[PDB]
Amino acid sequence: TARAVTTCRMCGAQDWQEVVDFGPVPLADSFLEPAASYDDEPRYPLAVVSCRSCRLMSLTHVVDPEVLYRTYPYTTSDSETIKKHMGHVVAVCVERFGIPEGSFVLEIGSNTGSQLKAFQNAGMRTLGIDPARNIAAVANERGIETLPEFFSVDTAALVKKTHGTPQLVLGRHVFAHIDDVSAVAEGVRDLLGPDSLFAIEVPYLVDMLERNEFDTIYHEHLSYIGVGSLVALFRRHGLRVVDVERLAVHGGSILVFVGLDEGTRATAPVVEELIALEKERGLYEDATYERFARHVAEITAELTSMVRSLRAEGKRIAGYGAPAKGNTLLNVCGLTADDLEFCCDTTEFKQGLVLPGTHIPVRSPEYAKTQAIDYYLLLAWNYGEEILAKEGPFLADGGRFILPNPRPSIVPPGEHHH
Ligand SMILES: Cc1cn([C@H]2C[C@H](O)[C@@H](COP(=O)(O)OP(=O)(O)O)O2)c(=O)[nH]c1=O
Ligand SMILES: [Zn+2]
């Protein structure tokens, strides 16, 4: 079972507004083998609360990290989207702060090591940290040195002793996936030199709220982060937020840069601008999160209505992709195998399995091309541009997509958008 949240991860306060509660829900990355019975399927409470002090949005509970990340499965290769995105992260980091060739770059949650490989091609020394022993060994086999550890003050000391001081410490997602964020911040304080940088990429709370991206809520994502809440945290551990760039990836993200409070790196104007923006858009006002909760109910309702309306007309519907967020969407909407006859997915592990809760079967794309599907529910909507670029034939035949946000809509639209 999962441990309930008491004090706030970032600022330490305990003043929680209730925003939305989806009740007990199965884990989004727990894909099941097909069976007659699913009675013993575990379910955990999924609900979010907003810290009135610093306005971090957090899940009400925390599912054991030994269950989640110690045996993660993860695709070798990746989207052309990701490959280019990884190369952009390198460019931003290296060029914006003039990191010389031969510099040392440490990555937390380094995974198979594709991101580190990009830094090596840019002429850098690297080292990975990832507690998934199965995946750490893969990266290690490929020639990308990776310590099978959790990041902490202790691991930071080990890195410094064996590999020296890093110019750049990188953490993607790992930041919104870790509960003890103080421990990470503390380990970073010890490890950074006077001019070193800590960079983290997470989904941006502003983007989430304005686009009603409620499906991005699942148990792996403990935190939903704005800049204000990070400043609040890093204040308490002798660190200063120095720069931020907004990114389109993952439905709207921010790449945040952090240095030592008394270090070389000057704070850019963008940091305070994004804090001024967060105030202006109502992140510190209860109304905004009641409005968000209302939008969820409206979208949930009309999206189920839309699906069942089409199925009543005899139109066949399926899912495109089987990402974690799809499993939130489908469970919250209460859709079954009677509603979506399958979900196509490129990941080989997932093919032949069944979705958590809904128990909708996952199939390969080559099977999907045999079927005469009328509508595809675009569960992997954050990869919309890549997917629509290659699905010309489907579109030409009269096929359509159902996009779930910012409001439910049908692609293609009835008229050309100028
Ligand atoms: C881009 C793309 C993704 N997918 C699927 C494969 C993965 O299971 C899933 C990717 O989502 P996932 O890796 O779960 O999270 P994120 O959306 O943050 O990457 O989408 C396809 O099936 N076809 C595609 O063309
Ligand atoms: Zn807080």
TrEMBL record:
Keywords: Metal-binding, Methyltransferase, S-adenosyl-L-methionine, Transferase, Zinc. Pfam families: Methyltransf_13, Methyltransf_14, Methyltransf_23. S-adenosyl-L-homocysteine 1 binds at residues 76, 111, 130, 151, 172. Residues 249-406 form the C-methyltransferase domain. S-adenosyl-L-homocysteine 2 binds at residues 111, 130, 151. S-adenosyl-L-methionine binds at residues 111, 130, 151, 172. InterPro entries: Methyltransf_Zn-bd_dom_put, Methyltransf_Zn-bd_dom_put_sf, MeTrfase_14, SAM-dependent_MTases_sf. Residues 8-69 form the Methyltransferase putative zinc binding domain. The modification Cysteine sulfenic acid (-SOH) is found at residue 344. Zn(2+) binds at residues 8, 11, 51, 54. One of its GO terms (molecular function) is methyltransferase activity. DTDP binds at residues 324-325, 345-347, 350, 382-383, 390. GO terms for biological process: antibiotic biosynthetic process; methylation. It comes from the Bacteria. PANTHER family: BLL5978 PROTEIN (PTHR43861:SF5), TRANS-ACONITATE 2-METHYLTRANSFERASE-RELATED (PTHR43861). This is D-mycarose 3-C-methyltransferase. It comes from Streptomyces argillaceus. The gene is mtmC.
